[PDB]
Symmetry: C3
Subunit: 173 residues, 3 copies
């Protein structure tokens, strides 16, 4: 006990950096599910987020599958197209937003507040994904971490779109 | 400052593995409290979850109390009966559920979404509980970690029971 | 990739203890935003929490700014006045509360449940803040960690104020 398996049945510590990486993707997936279930976004944002939840499972499958020279069967890996899709969504959803000069106090709607929670969890997942690469520079792909990086940018953008209180700004004083 | 006490007044780093373990049990307890307060489960599931919250405090008391040869007064420890009770709940609640072939996108009801959040926090708590044992193989009991392990199985089962959207499945594509 | 910048443009690992500290302040800020957006506290508690969200950004700016002998421009730092303000709020809000003899099961209202979630995240942020100091005893200030320490005391107090189920107590049995 205290051990479990990767996608290739390889035994691993429940403390393992790869497992912590795709476990945090799970936590991020749940956080996005909470934003959907309690924030009730419009149908278009709902479809975007549901697609991200699908992507996050693709990222966890990538992280749970060691990189090998020639595998038994082709592995599921994140690709740059995943990230370019997030970039496209960022541009579209950020186009109507006014310019931001300072930090925003997270909150507002249930949807915007929960998108902020998901943002911070996703960024925690990203930190874990980079720690997985640091531990296995040759065995772990960096695209999962790069996908999580841009996802937090998108979640921040969507949190602003969804906020009816507008941008409540941080006054350093 | 930066130090605190275990159950025996022993001084400990606020970074300590045992403290991180029972602190994550606290976070898991709060997550379950959110599922209750926002998901409004039926009275039967409410009683199950409230009992788990009670168990989690028993687990934290176990984790905060070093194992010693003969203690001043008898310690509160998790027992196999705690875990067998969770196993019994898993079987009962999983009996009516259809067979699952793939991963589920967390979400659906407020209750099912928040049970997914609690699931991922509990699994984070489990990882912390195993790290506590690794650091003190002789001083920390493994039953807290084993209880958290099966609790995440139950929370997954309950999340399916509570979901009115059924199982929204991950399409790897 | 896998690197980012502190407030002084210094390059840093996305695993860095200082970054993990002010990232957890962000997560705590979001958690408080969720309590506001879903718990709908009265106007007075709303103003207290919004002020704390402002303080947390001040703490993150402190943590992201290395301590130096004579800086280019004066840094934003947490002060004892921040903490004394939290102490004042604790006393006021705890005055009407009955004496507590045991642990409370987190939950109750949406507000009180989410204040418990925020409490546990803030305590996680505190642990991270102390780890930042341990890593840079001379470069990181301890007042951010001390502010987070007392904030968790206040959030516990407010969670009791907000709970309509009163104190649901842990029975170790
Ligand atoms: C990595 C991993 C995860 C990671 C990341 C997964 C991801 N993002 O892709 C995380 C931590 C998120 C995870 C979570 C869970 N997992 Co998991 N996981 C694994 C693992 C190791 C690899 C999965 C994978 O990525 N395969 C790669 C993809 C491409 O394979 P695939 O073509 O989709 O085929 C998979 C599915 O059909 C899946 N599957 C088949 N039947 C079932 C039934 C259920 C309920 C689930 C969830 C999956 C499942 O298993 C196949 C092989 O992986 C497998 C064991 C293994 N060695 O394969 C366990 C495994 C799939 N996990 C399992 C379980 C139980 C779960 C959890 C319910 C644990 C929990 N209580 O929280 C959750 C469910 C989360 C959710 N939303 O559905 C079980 C499912 C079997 C069962 N009926 O008990 C497995 C088989 C391990 C085990 N034997 O206990 N897991
Ligand atoms: C481990 C520990 C926890 C851990 C795990 C606890 C668990 N799962 O059992 C965690 C991190 C979850 C925790 C949380 C908190 N704790 Co604590 N904790 C401790 C500790 C170290 C041991 C508790 C224990 O498990 N005892 C074993 C069981 C079997 O003992 P028991 O028979 O139940 O007797 C206990 C209770 O009566 C309890 N108690 C007595 N009066 C009060 C009043 C309050 C408000 C609470 C919460 C408890 C409490 O203290 C007795 C001795 O432990 C004690 C200090 C110590 N050395 O005992 C502090 C202690 C109980 N904690 C304390 C506090 C303040 C809290 C928090 C409010 C901190 C916060 N701001 O979040 C939260 C409350 C969480 C909740 N839902 O109620 C205080 C309570 C005293 C007070 N009035 O200020 C103590 C005494 C430490 C201190 N002096 O500051 N804690
Ligand atoms: C530390 C830090 C944070 C930390 C802690 C911040 C804190 N608690 O104070 C955390 C992790 C919380 C954080 C979060 C984010 N940050 Co930040 N962060 C930094 C950083 C390194 C220092 C900020 C600071 O504390 N300055 C000290 C205070 C006193 O300075 P100030 O007088 O307030 O001046 C600042 C503001 O005007 C701010 N600013 C100016 N324009 C904009 C626009 C936006 C959208 C934001 C959020 C801030 C911002 O930048 C100035 C210089 O820091 C800067 C880069 C740098 N080297 O300065 C990036 C920076 C401010 N962050 C940035 C971003 C993108 C974000 C996030 C949106 C990331 C995300 N996707 O989650 C979130 C927003 C969180 C929120 N609620 O608003 C950007 C903003 C620029 C832009 N338009 O893209 C910067 C400039 C880095 C970058 N170039 O990518 N960050
Ligand atoms: C926006 C600012 O937040 C910090 N930063 C960058 N990436 C992350 C992450 N994944 N998690 C937390 N903080 C991060 C850096 O300091 C950056 O400059
Ligand atoms: C279900 C899959 O999730 C991983 N796994 C097992 N236990 C945990 C845990 N506590 N936290 C996160 N991931 C876990 C293993 O890879 C297992 O096979
Ligand atoms: C109240 C009890 O909780 C533990 N404790 C103290 N500070 C923290 C923290 N920031 N996070 C988690 N647990 C903590 C100590 O054991 C203390 O005695
Ligand atoms: Mg980034
Ligand atoms: Mg398990
Ligand atoms: Mg404290």
């Amino acid at each position: 006990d205290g051990t479990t398996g990767l996608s290739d049945m390889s035994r691993v510590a429940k403390t393992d950096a790869r497992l912590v990486a795709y476990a945090d993707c799970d936590e991020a997936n749940a956080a996005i599910g909470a934003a959907l279930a309690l924030g009730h976004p419009d149908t278009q944002i709902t479809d975007v987020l549901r697609q991200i939840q699908n992507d996050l499972f693709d990222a966890g499958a990538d992280l749970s599958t060691p990189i090998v020279e020639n595998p038994k069967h082709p592995p599921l890996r994140i690709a740059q197209s995943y990230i370019d899709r997030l970039e496209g969504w960022c541009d579209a959803y950020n186009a109507g937003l006014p310019a931001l000069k300072s930090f925003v106090l997270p909150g507002g709607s249930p949807l915007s507040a929960l998108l902020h929670v998901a943002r911070t969890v996703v960024r925690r997942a990203e930190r874990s994904a980079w720690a997985a690469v640091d531990a296995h520079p040759e065995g772990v792909s960096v695209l999962p971490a790069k996908y999580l990086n841009r996802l937090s940018d998108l979640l921040f953008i969507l949190s602003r779109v969804a906020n009816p209180d507008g941008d409540v700004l941080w006054r350093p004083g």
